[PDB]
Amino acid sequence: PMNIFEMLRIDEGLRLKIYKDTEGYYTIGIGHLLTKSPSLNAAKSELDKAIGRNTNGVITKDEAEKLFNQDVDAAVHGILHNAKLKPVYDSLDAVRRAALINMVFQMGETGVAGFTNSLRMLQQKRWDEAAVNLAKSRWYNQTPNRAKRVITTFRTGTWDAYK
Amino acid sequence: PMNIFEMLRIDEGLRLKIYKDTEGYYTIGIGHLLTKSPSLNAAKSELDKAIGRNTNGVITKDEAEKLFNQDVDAAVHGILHNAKLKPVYDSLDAVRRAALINMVFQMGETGVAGFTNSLRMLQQKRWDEAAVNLAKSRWYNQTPNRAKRVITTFRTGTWDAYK
Ligand SMILES: [Cu+2]
């Protein structure tokens, strides 16, 4: 069925070969930034560290999956030790928790924490209201396809936007 | 619509009023231990500090999910800081991760960590072997129905045991 992995797989892609994101940054797997450096070798260097193997620049689904888990773990962990985020997160239902995790995964804990108002409405289950507000963000402006999916997940509490 | 929440709801129940678990400790929601004390007052008091109101020992589904989310947070967080658990955790696909969480929710991080040989089989993705091994545990012997569900989840990587 549906889960944070399938959801993020859809939003971030899944690639077994190093590629440039939309800032030209080297990335692999499911939206995993290797480095800002423009050097391809620095990128494979960081890759080999992360995977534990001389990969040249290609990995396996399994390696991409393990990588992904470590990244999600880091998003979740960041939510748990952030006192702005943990209470909204825990107030949420299972489907909407995945939405929040998505945001932290994309822009990081500190950033998602910057959404003070939306976070309130969400914790207060002001669903429609939250969706409207989030839509005005710079986040939506920069990645509207992805944002509307996340946003609509917040409104409905279903996986409708990924099915 | 299947997730860790639906999974543990089934395994542990979802109760909206305080009740005694096996061992007669006061409990609510999804196997949420309130207090070991024999006073129903003490149980209500703890309950009111957790939810944010005077409940009289009755909560809503949302509220019970809030509580469930806090217990789940604790399980994963515990896994994240456990050298014996995190690497197996990260080797697992999402469905299988919920199975591991399930186990930690039931018996505790330290307990699950005891399954040294079964975890290794899990990590190495030796599913049939892991399943065969886990069945020979005391856990299986004590709660064979729930355990077989969890075990079958590890064996297949699907939700079929809960449908
Ligand atoms: Cu921690």
Swiss-Prot record, chains A, B:
Induction remarks: Expressed late in the viral replication.
Record-level GO cellular component terms: host cell cytoplasm
Result, substituting residue 133 to M/F: 2-fold decrease in enzymatic activity
Gene Ontology terms describing biological process: cell wall macromolecule catabolic process; defense response to bacterium; peptidoglycan catabolic process; viral release from host cell by cytolysis
Localization (cell): Host cytoplasm
Residues at which substrate binds: 33, 105, 118, 133
Matching SUPFAM superfamilies: Lysozyme-like
pH dependency: Optimum pH is 7.3.
Effect of residue 12 to Q: Complete loss of activity
Record note on what altering residue 133 to I does: 5-fold decrease in enzymatic activity
Domain of life: Viruses
Reactions mediated catalytically: Hydrolysis of (1->4)-beta-linkages between N-acetylmuramic acid and N-acetyl-D-glucosamine residues in a peptidoglycan and between N-acetyl-D-glucosamine residues in chitodextrins
UniProt entry tagged with the keyword Ribosomal protein: no
Reported impact of residue 118 to V: 50-fold decrease in enzymatic activity
EC number(s) stated in the UniProt entry for this protein: 3.2.1.17
Function: Endolysin with lysozyme activity that degrades host peptidoglycans and participates with the holin and spanin proteins in the sequential events which lead to the programmed host cell lysis releasing the mature viral particles. Once the holin has permeabilized the host cell membrane, the endolysin can reach the periplasm and break down the peptidoglycan layer.
Protein name per Swiss-Prot or TrEMBL: Endolysin
Annotated source species: Enterobacteria phage T4 (Bacteriophage T4)
